[PDB]
From a paper:
MurAA catalyzes the first committed step of peptidoglycan synthesis, transferring an enolpyruvate moiety from phosphoenolpyruvate (PEP) to UDP-N-acetylglucosamine to produce UDP-GlcNAc-enolpyruvate and inorganic phosphate. MurAA comprises two domains with the active site Cys119 located in a flexible loop (Ala114–Ile126) that is solvent exposed in the ligand-free state. We refer to the domain containing the active site loop as the “catalytic domain” (residues 21–232) and the other as the “C-terminal domain” (residues 1–20, 233–419).
FOS inhibits MurAA by blocking access to the catalytic site making Cys119 inaccessible to PEP. Fosfomycin is an irreversible inhibitor of MurAA and is structurally analogous to the substrate PEP. In addition to being quite distant from the active site, positions 149 and 220 are proximal to each other, and are both surface exposed, suggesting that these mutations could comprise part of a protein surface involved in interactions with other proteins. The structures of E. faecium MurAA with FOS–UDP-GlcNAc and by serendipity UDP–MurNAc suggest that, like other members of the MurA family, the protein transitions from an open to closed conformation upon UDP-GlcNAc binding.
Residue numbers in the entry: 1 to 420
The structure:
Amino acid sequence: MEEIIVRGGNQLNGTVRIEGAKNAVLPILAASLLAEEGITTLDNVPILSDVFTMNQVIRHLNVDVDFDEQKNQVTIDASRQLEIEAPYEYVSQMRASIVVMGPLLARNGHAKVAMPGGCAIGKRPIDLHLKGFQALGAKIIQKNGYIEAIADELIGNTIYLDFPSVGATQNIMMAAVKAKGTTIIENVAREPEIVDLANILNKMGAQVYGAGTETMRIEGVDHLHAVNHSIVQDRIEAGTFMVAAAMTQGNVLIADAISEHNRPLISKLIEMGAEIIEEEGGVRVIGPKHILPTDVKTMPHPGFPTDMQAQMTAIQLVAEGTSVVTETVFENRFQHLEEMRRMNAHVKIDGNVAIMDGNHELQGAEVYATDLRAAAALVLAGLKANGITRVRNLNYLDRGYYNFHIKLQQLGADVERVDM
Ligand SMILES: CC(=O)N[C@H]1[C@@H](OP(=O)(O)OP(=O)(O)OC[C@H]2O[C@@H](n3ccc(=O)[nH]c3=O)[C@H](O)[C@@H]2O)O[C@H](CO)[C@@H](O)[C@@H]1O
Ligand SMILES: *[C@H](C)[C@H](O)P(=O)(O)O
Ligand SMILES: [Cl-]
Ligand SMILES: [K+]
Ligand SMILES: [K+]
Ligand SMILES: [K+]
Ligand SMILES: [K+]
Ligand SMILES: [K+]
Ligand code: NA
């Protein structure tokens, strides 16, 4: 139905406002299932397709969910007896749908949830979620396609995560808050959305210690209640605009940006010649006349985030030399580079390593997003391409960006969203 059309060759200048984080609001919506009494009010909720999908997941569990889009506010009433089967129709259309399992085990000792969807960028198993629930006393059944977890009593345990999985950390945390005694989770995700989640849980009456460190300690409680919470700013949307500014000889203030949440990105953009200044109003990015090449290796926190990789390849592909990216987190997150070949990108891919020769002019082309960050990366490449770039499959973009074309237009970019 729709495409984003870009004409390249404009400098970006001005101030951009950033929405609440996609990847904080979704597990916090799941956490609202733990509030046995009261009404949860979430503020700074972004208008994203994943929020509408997650709200339908939760409503099917016998919960009232009201999204006031004008106020960026969601109210949740989970005070009734929860149903325990999440609806495949919605679960299959996003990733974070799976993290209703933890709260359903905490409230009811019973959860039925299918394998989730989301960005089609690798195998994306959930084995570590299921291992953690087993460690807390759940029996895990697969009937013919389905995943059922049953716990007559959740009991705290020590749980070592083989990989610091964001979703597994969230799912296990949300079961453990109502487990009997102490849970210790070793090698947890340290991403700042884990901290935002822990902070709302603690406000709701939980005892979650060590969020943002490698070891979490949870002391089970009998009851959680509803609170008011404001979602943390979206560090990935923030970072996307930092890259846009850095690649267009721009001067952009990212309003109220949290520099602590983008230390790797800021460091790498400085290596490429950006000037980045922490100001009273936000983080200012000044793009250089001569973009310098740099290498990127994705890693779990505290290394370079995989959710900035695609966007970063757009600036690497216009740098004055050869850059390398190594994608260590996901197995299939280079399809945007194949599309950028249509735009005259010179890139060699060998397993998890891509080598980019930026000494070529990108040319406008019709390109097809395959996933959320790939869509943003193709629009960014458009900002530097000679002529007209048409970015298609905006369903992927709408999972994580609100008004992306309007925010770019307001910085002086020639970007439109139109019907095909
Ligand atoms: C909705 C949401 O918050 N999405 C984010 C979340 O996804 P998500 O929570 O799916 O990401 P994980 O941290 O779990 O996955 C990272 C890697 O861990 C491994 N793994 C994970 C779980 C498991 O049970 N077994 C296993 O092996 C896989 O190698 C996977 O490739 O964190 C990712 C990593 O920063 C981000 O890219 C996503 O945007
Ligand atoms: C792309 C990786 C998205 O953030 P998810 O919601 O599928 O994880
Ligand atoms: Cl996607
Ligand atoms: K319980
Ligand atoms: K039960
Ligand atoms: K917050
Ligand atoms: K170049
Ligand atoms: K890879
Ligand atoms: Na969508």
